[PDB]
Amino acid sequence: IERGKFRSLTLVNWNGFFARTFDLDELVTTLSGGNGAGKSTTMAAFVTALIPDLTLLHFRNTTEAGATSGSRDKGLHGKLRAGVCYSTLDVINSRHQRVVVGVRLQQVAGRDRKVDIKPFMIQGLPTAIQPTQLLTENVGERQARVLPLNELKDRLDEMEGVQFKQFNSITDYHAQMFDLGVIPKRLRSASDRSKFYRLIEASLYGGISSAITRSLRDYLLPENSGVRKAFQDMEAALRENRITLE
Amino acid sequence: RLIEASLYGGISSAITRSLRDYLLPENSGVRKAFQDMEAALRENRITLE
Amino acid sequence: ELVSWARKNDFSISLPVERLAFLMAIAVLNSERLDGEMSEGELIDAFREVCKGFEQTAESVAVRANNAINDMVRQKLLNRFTSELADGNAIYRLTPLGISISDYYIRQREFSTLRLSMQLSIVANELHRAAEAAEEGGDEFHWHRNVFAPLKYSVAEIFDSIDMSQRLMDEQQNFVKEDIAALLNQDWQAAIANCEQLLSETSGTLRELQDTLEAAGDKLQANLLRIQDANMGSGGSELVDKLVFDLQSKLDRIISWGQQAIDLWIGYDRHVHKFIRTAIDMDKNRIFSQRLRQSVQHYFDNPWTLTVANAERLLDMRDEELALRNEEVTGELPLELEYEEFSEINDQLAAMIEKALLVYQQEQRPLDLGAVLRDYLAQHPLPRHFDVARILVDQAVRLGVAEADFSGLPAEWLAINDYGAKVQAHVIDTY
Amino acid sequence: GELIDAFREVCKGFEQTAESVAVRANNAINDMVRQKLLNRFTSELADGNAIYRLTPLGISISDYYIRQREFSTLRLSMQLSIVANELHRAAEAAEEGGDEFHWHRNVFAPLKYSVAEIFDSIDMSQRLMDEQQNFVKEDIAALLNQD
Amino acid sequence: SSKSVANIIRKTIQREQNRIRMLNQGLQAVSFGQVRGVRLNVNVRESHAILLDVLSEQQEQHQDLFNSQRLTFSEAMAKLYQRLNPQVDMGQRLPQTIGEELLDYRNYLELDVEVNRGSDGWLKAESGALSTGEAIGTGMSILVMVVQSWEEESRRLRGKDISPCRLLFLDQAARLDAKSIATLFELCERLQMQLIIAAPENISPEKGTTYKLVRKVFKNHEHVHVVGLRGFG
Amino acid sequence: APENISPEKGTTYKLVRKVFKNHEHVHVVGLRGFG
Amino acid sequence: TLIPRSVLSELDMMVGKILCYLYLSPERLANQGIFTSQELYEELISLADEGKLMKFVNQRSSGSDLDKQKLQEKVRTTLNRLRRLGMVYFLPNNNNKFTITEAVFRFGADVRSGDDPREIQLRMIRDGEAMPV
Amino acid sequence: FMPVKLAQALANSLFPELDSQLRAGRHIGIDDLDNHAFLMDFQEQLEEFYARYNVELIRAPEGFFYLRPRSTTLIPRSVLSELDMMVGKILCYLYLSPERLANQGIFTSQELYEELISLADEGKLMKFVNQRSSGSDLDKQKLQEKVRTTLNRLRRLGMVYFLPNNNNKFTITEAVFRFGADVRSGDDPREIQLRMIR
Numbered sequence A: 001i002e003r004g005k006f007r008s009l010t011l012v013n014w015n016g017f018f019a020r021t022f023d024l025d026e027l028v029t030t031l032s033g034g035n036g037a038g039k040s041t042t043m044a045a046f047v048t049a050l051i052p053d054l055t056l057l058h059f060r061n062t063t064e065a066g067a068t069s070g071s072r073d074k075g076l077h078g079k080l081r082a083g084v085c086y087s088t089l090d091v092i093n094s095r096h097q098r099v100v101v102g103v104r105l106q107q108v109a110g111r112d113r114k115v116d117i118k119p120f121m122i123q124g125l126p127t128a129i130q131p132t133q134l135l136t137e138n139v140g141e142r143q144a145r146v147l148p149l150n151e152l153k154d155r156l157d158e159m160e161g162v163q164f165k166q167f168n169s170i171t172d173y174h175a176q177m178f179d180l181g182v183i184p185k186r187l188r189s190a191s192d193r194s195k196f197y198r199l200i201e202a203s204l205y206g207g208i209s210s211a212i213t214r215s216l217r218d219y220l221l222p223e224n225s226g227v228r229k230a231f232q233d234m235e236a237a238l239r240e241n242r243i244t245l246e
Numbered sequence B: 001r002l003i004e005a006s007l008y009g010g011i012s013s014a015i016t017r018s019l020r021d022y023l024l025p026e027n028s029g030v031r032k033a034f035q036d037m038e039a040a041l042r043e044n045r046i047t048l049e
Numbered sequence C: 001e002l003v004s005w006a007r008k009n010d011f012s013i014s015l016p017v018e019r020l021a022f023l024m025a026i027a028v029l030n031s032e033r034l035d036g037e038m039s040e041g042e043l044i045d046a047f048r049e050v051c052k053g054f055e056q057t058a059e060s061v062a063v064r065a066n067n068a069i070n071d072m073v074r075q076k077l078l079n080r081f082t083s084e085l086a087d088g089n090a091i092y093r094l095t096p097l098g099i100s101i102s103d104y105y106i107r108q109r110e111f112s113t114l115r116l117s118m119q120l121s122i123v124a125n126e127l128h129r130a131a132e133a134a135e136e137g138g139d140e141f142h143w144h145r146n147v148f149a150p151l152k153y154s155v156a157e158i159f160d161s162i163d164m165s166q167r168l169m170d171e172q173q174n175f176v177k178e179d180i181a182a183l184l185n186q187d188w189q190a191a192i193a194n195c196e197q198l199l200s201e202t203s204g205t206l207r208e209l210q211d212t213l214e215a216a217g218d219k220l221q222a223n224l225l226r227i228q229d230a231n232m233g234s235g236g237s238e239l240v241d242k243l244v245f246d247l248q249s250k251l252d253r254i255i256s257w258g259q260q261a262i263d264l265w266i267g268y269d270r271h272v273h274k275f276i277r278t279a280i281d282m283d284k285n286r287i288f289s290q291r292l293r294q295s296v297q298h299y300f301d302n303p304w305t306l307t308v309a310n311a312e313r314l315l316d317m318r319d320e321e322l323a324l325r326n327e328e329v330t331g332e333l334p335l336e337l338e339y340e341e342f343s344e345i346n347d348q349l350a351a352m353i354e355k356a357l358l359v360y361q362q363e364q365r366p367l368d369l370g371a372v373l374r375d376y377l378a379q380h381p382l383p384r385h386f387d388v389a390r391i392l393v394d395q396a397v398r399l400g401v402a403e404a405d406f407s408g409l410p411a412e413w414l415a416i417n418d419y420g421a422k423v424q425a426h427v428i429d430t431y
Numbered sequence D: 001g002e003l004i005d006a007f008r009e010v011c012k013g014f015e016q017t018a019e020s021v022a023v024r025a026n027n028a029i030n031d032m033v034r035q036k037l038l039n040r041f042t043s044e045l046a047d048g049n050a051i052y053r054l055t056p057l058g059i060s061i062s063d064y065y066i067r068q069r070e071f072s073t074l075r076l077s078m079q080l081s082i083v084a085n086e087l088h089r090a091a092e093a094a095e096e097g098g099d100e101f102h103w104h105r106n107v108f109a110p111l112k113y114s115v116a117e118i119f120d121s122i123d124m125s126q127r128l129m130d131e132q133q134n135f136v137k138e139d140i141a142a143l144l145n146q147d
Numbered sequence E: 001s002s003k004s005v006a007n008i009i010r011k012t013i014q015r016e017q018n019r020i021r022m023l024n025q026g027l028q029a030v031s032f033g034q035v036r037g038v039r040l041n042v043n044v045r046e047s048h049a050i051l052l053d054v055l056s057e058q059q060e061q062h063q064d065l066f067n068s069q070r071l072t073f074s075e076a077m078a079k080l081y082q083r084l085n086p087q088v089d090m091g092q093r094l095p096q097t098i099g100e101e102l103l104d105y106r107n108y109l110e111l112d113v114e115v116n117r118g119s120d121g122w123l124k125a126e127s128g129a130l131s132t133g134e135a136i137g138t139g140m141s142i143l144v145m146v147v148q149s150w151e152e153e154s155r156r157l158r159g160k161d162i163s164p165c166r167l168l169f170l171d172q173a174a175r176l177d178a179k180s181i182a183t184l185f186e187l188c189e190r191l192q193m194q195l196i197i198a199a200p201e202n203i204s205p206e207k208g209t210t211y212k213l214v215r216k217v218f219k220n221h222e223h224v225h226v227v228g229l230r231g232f233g
Numbered sequence F: 001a002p003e004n005i006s007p008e009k010g011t012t013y014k015l016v017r018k019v020f021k022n023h024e025h026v027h028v029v030g031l032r033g034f035g
Numbered sequence G: 001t002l003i004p005r006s007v008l009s010e011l012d013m014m015v016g017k018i019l020c021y022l023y024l025s026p027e028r029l030a031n032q033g034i035f036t037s038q039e040l041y042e043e044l045i046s047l048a049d050e051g052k053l054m055k056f057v058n059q060r061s062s063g064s065d066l067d068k069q070k071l072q073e074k075v076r077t078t079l080n081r082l083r084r085l086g087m088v089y090f091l092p093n094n095n096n097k098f099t100i101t102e103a104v105f106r107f108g109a110d111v112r113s114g115d116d117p118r119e120i121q122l123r124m125i126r127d128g129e130a131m132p133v
Numbered sequence H: 001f002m003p004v005k006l007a008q009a010l011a012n013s014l015f016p017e018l019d020s021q022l023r024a025g026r027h028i029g030i031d032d033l034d035n036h037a038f039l040m041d042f043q044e045q046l047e048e049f050y051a052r053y054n055v056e057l058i059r060a061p062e063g064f065f066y067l068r069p070r071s072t073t074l075i076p077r078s079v080l081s082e083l084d085m086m087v088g089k090i091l092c093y094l095y096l097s098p099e100r101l102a103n104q105g106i107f108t109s110q111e112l113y114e115e116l117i118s119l120a121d122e123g124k125l126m127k128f129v130n131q132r133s134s135g136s137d138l139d140k141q142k143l144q145e146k147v148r149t150t151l152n153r154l155r156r157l158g159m160v161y162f163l164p165n166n167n168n169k170f171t172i173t174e175a176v177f178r179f180g181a182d183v184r185s186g187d188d189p190r191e192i193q194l195r196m197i198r
């Protein structure tokens, strides 16, 4: 079988990036540049596109990886510019379907460095349409402008064959992505989402993540309900015996 | 802590917390002045009692 | 994936009371038929009789009979064969689906434990025989005829039969629950003893079935592991393993149910007692129940409502509404990606140095980094010298070790050029 | 808890939404329970607080065509061999004799159930062959239309 | 009931041990520093095997502990675990939580990561006894095995026609040398795993695609300029 | 630094691990003065 | 009262009386105390007057299935409120199934005494047990 | 056991009414002499008693006491509408200094209605009544009725003391400062209040 692939990553109105699309590689994509180039920003934007759960997203420095820094800030807000921003993934499914998943990010006005995230998906987009252009409107002389979610919905609905969906919960977002062969595990419960984010977070910083090795049992071995049922049966028996004894 | 923070590099957490302990020396003059104030208070309390 | 298979199959089933009765009569006659053949001349008679019993005449007898037979044939219930000599010039036979539908209702009742014991004994004999045949061994054909034809079919069929017995017991449990429920409606306080007996007999029957099941589960498992051990006697016995892996679960599964059902029933039982201890104890005469029923029926003739505490909820301050940042950001769109190429000068230099140095390894000549570096750096301009030295060292240290490094005598910093370049390395001796 | 999931999946495959998934699933399960297709047991701890099991009629119907339509002669031979062994054993046990309980446990429990079941299995194999004959007739009839 | 419990735990443990032991052969002697191979060690814990034996055969002998009104079932299990096998010397963790932990079958298996460091055989992998590159390689091996296991488990729910996408990251790749990066590349390609790596210097010039980013201050704001790179010119 | 960077100023020490007499040994080479 | 007071709706009385019936009804013994809202509605319509009970759901109902669904939803809402009152417990994982509690017996306080209904109603209202509507 | 002074405070005959009004969210200011003195005296223990409920007994800088529910509050919580906070800020503004010459501490529903209409933006008013409305009689009547309802809701909280009669004319208490903004050095209270409201 032909495994699906991540074609490209698009960044809109990000810190440093206005509208930039990196075409990913079949095997390895490398990013270089002096300190502060913005590679970590690209990684963060990708992972935000993958797991938009705001509770999990925490972009600590590679130094103090997992060491509590008490900054009170997850670091995502400072990585976005004012206004609308987008982070999208084009994926070729094993069914050879081009699906553009993505999220609209937006800073929340106020002293708190808080952000709002709204996921979305597009199916059936023609292979000739690039997300960078799809998400921007050419206004002025070579001066494209970004358009909000409502405008994007209007633009896409006017097209033929493209199906756009907007999710009210990251749960359905993950469910749809899993349905299209994008996620290995079905993140039905919040614990599954936490484990998934733990895996990608350990990968990003690389190496032996303390939490992983500490819960390797939970991460590898599957949960069994028969043992739980048997223990509950024994619990009920013991409770009845105690009732009788008392 | 100083040496290991240098070794691993980065903004060390403990150093960041105890910045005041690390970058500021301990002055005995203020402690002596406070001891004198406490002695004066003790004498005042004894007189009042 | 089976959803599309079912969708394209297009199967669906329909048996009104008359069609179902005709099918049941056909099954009964086939059971009492001598040689297991049914000509349509008797099918028409059976349909006439069933329609007469049901007392309905939509059309003539013949047309109704023909329509029903054709419907059942196309509904995959009967199979027709053209034989002119047969009465009616056709012979009809029940199809597997028809047999299943008919016997779903018609089977002899089978809850007796003597049955379960006899199937277990038959299974024990056949399983032991198959295990011994496998252990003895043989060629591919012998392996087949001893472990794939006899074992597979027999064990599958009889485990299915045992499971069917368990399902029949499940049906009996359901029927006894319904009987208890109906009895408590008719006698109330006087059915307590009847219900307690019925519970007693059902519990005893369940316990005896569990005992009979566990009477042979362990040894059958042992024989199955023995067959697993003997299976590996040939490379083509893969399929056998599947059965030796499949026939495991079923057995254990069966035993599991034999306890699980009791675990369920011993639970349900308690509830019944609780009901008797709670529902009827305070309603011995049931009068409260009828009076509640009439109150429900005639409530709105005196509509009354109860009073409950409704303390106020602690009103709180709404957090400030969150307003996002909107600025209509605009900017230049990136051009087409440019490109740059990597310089392989260092690769060429490394190849040069490796070729120049391989002679030392070939001849096992003692290599002195000082002299070699001093000689070789003369061929390059000063700014490149460093980028050479490093590379040369990288190439030199892969070739053996220096024995002096274990002497505890530090080496000196030998100069390798003008301008003040120095090197510290012992002679490389042990290649 | 798994029956509802299975009904959701089948309904999704069939692409029809008369009502919500839950109401359709509940109606179908209740209909099958009352139609003598499933048996329900109340167990609070179970996912969904209920345990369902196929009834004999449901088992028979399902296996109407999703059983193997077995035509291999090696099968028929192995059932015949099993029958031969069991029948000979029962005959020898009867010939040896015994009390009423021995007569029962040797000629009524083992013989009756086993022989009935396996003769029914052999008849079922013959019926499957009848189905195959019908299918080959239909295949010939369709082929003669095309070539 | 206690006997049935112990039996089901034993069966589940055996099944999981077999599955993991079969999976272990999915590794092909990765070369990272002095680490030559990575392996998963699954073993039933004797401290818990004794507990299973006591539960399955000698439940009654300790009823005095079980039927105490002071102890809940979790606390009763914890106290029983304390009673037998007293040399484990658990820490300051409370009886309630340790009992709750005892109620999960997975706990009963020691599941650890072994590495064939140099020529010392297979040793337990402790971050405190491994170089940075060795630890990074071991962590990547663990993550790839975990994602493989997740894919395998979901093989039933998913359709037969879809293979989920595979992608991981590695920031500050400069911590790895050329040999380690080549080993990582060969592993990822053998496992059809996509990788996004970052390093100030182009550490992988002759494989996959590469980009270089340069940040420019521009009219009191910032812009990132991206340029593709190619192996040869 | 694992060979990635080559600071021209100061002392540099190239290290390579090997097996000699069935013992782990770090072959060490030194350079300095460049620049 | 220093703590405010409130009275259940007439539909709440219907569902509570029905719930008491189910607690005392042996026909549903197989359920073992676990009941679904659908069964509760079926029993309610069996014992009550379908259309005349529906009249309260909407004044202009005449058996329209839209109003039928409205009555089902109203019954579900009243069941949730009673759950809030402790008369019924949803199952640890299921909000579509529930187990009855003995508190429901209060819905029969007007009939627990074998006397004339019109005197017991006055006694209760005097005691504050039940106000009228 | 129990703290002795806590037992004394709970046993006091004033405790039932005050407890009911607190659990109802009412704010106890300096006007309620007996209740305010009781809370002043026994705060050190009622704070613990109401912290047992995962609620905080807060004495505002103005002085009035109230209960703030945490996320884990054991007292059924509720949230004021948007119109409720808007009206609260309007009254906080109206707790003004020229107010003394304007209404002498006694306002009428008409004052609040006119202030709300003139001061608030049209979009929020429509959001209050309904989006599709645009300057109509029925919509304005419904808005006035909702204004009266929220005024009653505030009265329940002790924010507004109605002058006793069916007619709508009341007085504003100091506790209304809860809706108010923080005061900085030299800031005009009017300006900061209006900036918050806008």
Ligand SMILES: Nc1ncnc2c1ncn2[C@@H]1O[C@H](COP(=O)(O)OP(=O)(O)OP(=O)(O)O)[C@@H](O)[C@H]1O
Binding pocket: A015, A033, A034, A035, A036, A037, A038, A039, A040, A041, A042, A075, A076, A077, A078, A079, A080, E199, E200
């Ligand atoms: N949340 C933030 N707030 C403010 N500045 C930020 C934030 N995140 C990143 N930056 C700045 O953006 C620039 C790029 O940061 P980033 O961490 O993405 O770079 P990088 O390429 O990963 O760097 P390095 O390889 O040195 O780690 C740096 O100037 C960083 O200081």
Ligand SMILES: [Mg+2]
Binding pocket: A036, A038, A039, A040, A041, E171
């Ligand atoms: Mg970085």
